[PDB]
Symmetry: D3
Subunit: 242 residues, 6 copies
């Protein structure tokens, strides 16, 4: 793998975004590698916990940017919707460690994790409105932030600090930048002492509550609204964005 580093030790799989030269901007190849890494961790009976982390200053700058809407949907449904939900549902605990900028598409990498630790310098945003689109393809915003804060960041394009995100429940813990990796691995190690079936079913309990609340249906619903963004952009310019 060119863009993703994978290691297993002490029952923990660590998946590292390794394209620091582009601020971990996501091309298709990177997303395919990342999905392969998640599947590896899912299928390795030695792995009890997964860490998602990133090299460099910034967790991820987002997606690396006649075209039909049909074509756009085919590609986005696979890599931005189905991959993300598949990661969400992997039956073992996962923790994202987020430093620096996590922008638009970056949210699709950390939101599917169960827990999020952020460094004090982390900044979460989704400014895709500038491009004519109503938020990224997988709409965690309302669930993670509450509707008022979700609209605030979509409408203004501003960034939320790590402490703001912690206040909405999107981030579990804010930690000093130099301690982010250490504190993440220590959490993962504590979780790995639990019986794997108990962790599987705890995760299932919370995620199934969310799905009964309408999470799956809402994610699908908003994916369609997202696609009208692209449809409008195409109708106006012939390009997927404004």
């Amino acid at each position: 793998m060119v863009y993703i580093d994978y290691g297993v030790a002490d029952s923990i799989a660590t998946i590292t975004l390794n394209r620091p030269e582009a601020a971990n901007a996501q091309n298709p190849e990177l997303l395919d590698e990342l999905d392969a890494a998640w599947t590896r961790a899912a299928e390795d009976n030695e792995v009890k916990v997964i860490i998602l982390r990133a090299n460099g200053k910034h967790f991820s700058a987002g997606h690396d940017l006649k075209i039909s809407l049909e074509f756009i949907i085919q590609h986005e449904a696979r890599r931005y919707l189905d991959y993300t939900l598949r990661w969400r549902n992997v039956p073992k605990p996962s923790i994202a460690a987020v430093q620096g900028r996590c922008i638009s598409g970056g949210l699709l990498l950390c939101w599917p994790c169960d827990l999020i630790l952020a460094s004090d310098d982390a900044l979460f945003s989704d400014p895709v409105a500038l491009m004519g689109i109503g938020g990224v393809e997988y709409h965690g915003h309302t669930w993670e932030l509450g509707p008022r804060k979700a609209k605030e960041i979509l409408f203004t394009g501003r960034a939320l600090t790590a402490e703001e995100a912690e206040r909405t429940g999107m981030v579990n813990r804010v930690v000093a930048r130099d301690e982010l990796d250490a504190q993440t691995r220590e959490l993962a190690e504590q979780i790995a002492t639990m019986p794997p079936f108990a962790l599987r079913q705890a995760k299932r309990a919370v995620n199934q509550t969310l799905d009964v609340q309408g999470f799956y249906a809402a994610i699908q619903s908003v994916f369609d609204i997202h696609q009208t963004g692209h449809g409008n952009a195409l109708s106006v310019s012939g390009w997927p964005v404004l």
Copy 2:
């Protein structure tokens, strides 16, 4: 009003589609008049029951089909006339009954589905072949609710017509009647309902419609409207026109 007849007699308002020369195809002018008629009936205290019906052989052939049209522009117009109007009719707090004869095609379904009850003549044919134009069903997706998911997928995938008898079997149609008795049986039913206390009728309607909304009807209608709009998006991207 040019296209819609409106009359009140014996506590009953009758709303009539009167464009038989175009098989009651729906332009914006007909829809704006139809909405004004629904409002008139809703606001007239002497009206207890509403009948929606149509002159001629066919109930409605559907929707009557700016250099660069934007999907934004399409959405604004369709959200007003095909979504908001339809839902407003659905929620009028008085019983309504649609009397459907002959062809009821695509947009025609948006006129009768918001009614509480539907009577159909034996010659009635219900269809939505808009897949032919590149779109996944009309703007207001009653299909799954009215027909069940398999029958909805069947008529959307094939563009075929359902008979009045087939529609009765799914529960979309309350009763099938002879063509020459359609108006008479509709009025007899309306009259029997109009003997009930208005507030009882209001809360019976509310009970069933609220059950539907709890089951997800409002949310699902809004959801499929966006799916519908991706159809227009795709067509605009391929041809520069809203349909294929």
Copy 3:
């Protein structure tokens, strides 16, 4: 007890409405005895299946109708006997089968709808004409679930009865049978079901009921209970009596 016969034999508990002289009309005493019967069957580990049936010609005519009566007073009584009892019967973790003959009117539906399966004689007639009294259907709104929304509105708006065959076509009735054969065929069905492992039956029942609750059944039943109470509220505000 006074209004309800209870017996157990070959792993089947038979609960019989035994007030044929008032067409099994439901007063509080009868309902309390019925609830006690359901509970006794629920708690007896020898009972694998429950049959609910009725003596005389009619399953049930429905509910048998202090200075100033408050809405609060009505709510307290109705929440217990018409809402909580009915849901509790619904959730008893053993299969239950209602045998319905003749007229099952308004509150009569609260007795059979909570059973898992319903067998009806070919003379059975189901109705809810409570709109006549100013109310939007009975307290437990199974109508939309059992009949579909259009048929539910139809019977609430008109007060008309559905035959056994009409009810079977919506899925409310599992099987229509000759009047003379209703009991025998119910008993045989119970006996066949009682040969299954009790925990398989419990979880089959739970699978279906839980699908209903995810669909919104519990929430909708609670929502329409309030709509119903607005009926009593209006009747009180207009006459000082809970019904018009």
Copy 4:
């Protein structure tokens, strides 16, 4: 542009709708509410308006519904309240452009129906939010935003006690987006509105829709309808006990 009780102006793509009954602490009579609705419709239909600001003159945002026929039926009450307290409020919620409420001083009971349908809420540090309508025999106002905006435990707390939440308390539940100094409330609201108005209108429309449709899939429309009936049982009880719609 303006009407009796509502001031209305457009400038730089922003429509500002101003409650203008400060001598009555913006108590809402039917006339004010019909005018407010007509203002929301004007801003919705005006293609030059990109963002809506809802604000209020005087010391208080709104004291709620104005208290000030032979036999009053529950039917009569439902007809009036369904129109002005349920249908108006939902329509404002659904206007396809961003809206921002600027809330100062008291926002009591029916006041909540004016700000809750806005997308964003900015509150001054002296803002106080409450719904003490339990004192009148009723289980919260007609449009039950409480559980969604505050969480169930806080919603029950304020309805059971009738107490006020400070602007900072409301911010912690996510009901208030930002708390600001009283003298800066108007300036900061305008500045936020101007920033939002630089965005493409269709991107804003679909962002708003994404969030509101998530809410509706979560059960928002259905729950609001459900609680409206619970509310009406309150009036039903009051009428049955006293012949008046409240205690």
Copy 5:
């Protein structure tokens, strides 16, 4: 490969269950080859419609039942993959699919046809799920309540009886019933007719209906009942030491 024939002709992909000597009973190898056929059909741009059919007298007798100490975890891991995830994946393939069901379709057989969009049944077809005999509350993917309504679903689960083609049609589970001799021909004719439609129209039509179902609670209910099914295996393990009940 060994148990599944796959072919493409005139924009139609036909997947045939080819284990008639075991009444198309499903081992893991058959299920893996079946999932591979669905993926091959989904990924081929030249495929516009999918047919699922079966050789022999019977569509599928279901899961072929014939591990040191068996844990529930072990069963869940296996069933979640092949009975839940496969089935939902097939359900969501973004092209129309048609099942042609002849003869017996029992228990896990339902998992093969229920994910298809349309079902044509021969008049000889018999649908049943008698898995309560084994201690379990219906098969792993609970389409029963959706396809049949709750009273008919409970009836077939409580009794273990079969529904005729005609009974299934009356609940909406079967789209059409045809003569056993005409099943294959009528299915092909239906697929060709559908294959003349614009692929993106068909995709969004399928999506419109399936998304209505998921807003109604389909995905969440399927997940919820999966766990209820697993309590059946938990109980059986606790009573018989085996994943299903034995005499």
Copy 6:
């Protein structure tokens, strides 16, 4: 009553857990007496508000654990851990839990069904039942009360939340000094009992019905079965209901 104290004064019913010898761990007899106390309060027309509190240093250490089929376990747990809890939740009068010290696992089933929760500054809430092989307790308030990320964190790690952390998720209405908990709970109860009972009943209904429309009843039922797969697995591995 052996384990539960019950008293009525000035329209307030006070229900006190009185098994400090086991940190108010819950056996079947304690749970039956608690359910009888809630029913008593529900039915007494002079009770307007209910307080649930606990003697000694700790609110409740959870279910008292000190061969069976899964069927047997489900029968017992559905009655006492699922049905009892939902019944308390739905009692048509305001209820307030006063929670001091440790509230562990099953303890949560006693306070969560209360409308409001006041906690002392030393209260600690946890659910470390993953240690026993089970995916959280039988009545899954966690996601509702804490949000999903915090719910997963406490179930995965087994750690305790402080009163102040619980307050930040909205699970706790107010944090008070230990010595003042009883007094602040009774004053809050007295204030609430000045309101019209029908208004309080319908305010309660409005919020709980919003929750049920959001999926609360359905979700609770769904997680019950997930919890029971915990027991099924434990039985399949160790012969016992836990690991």
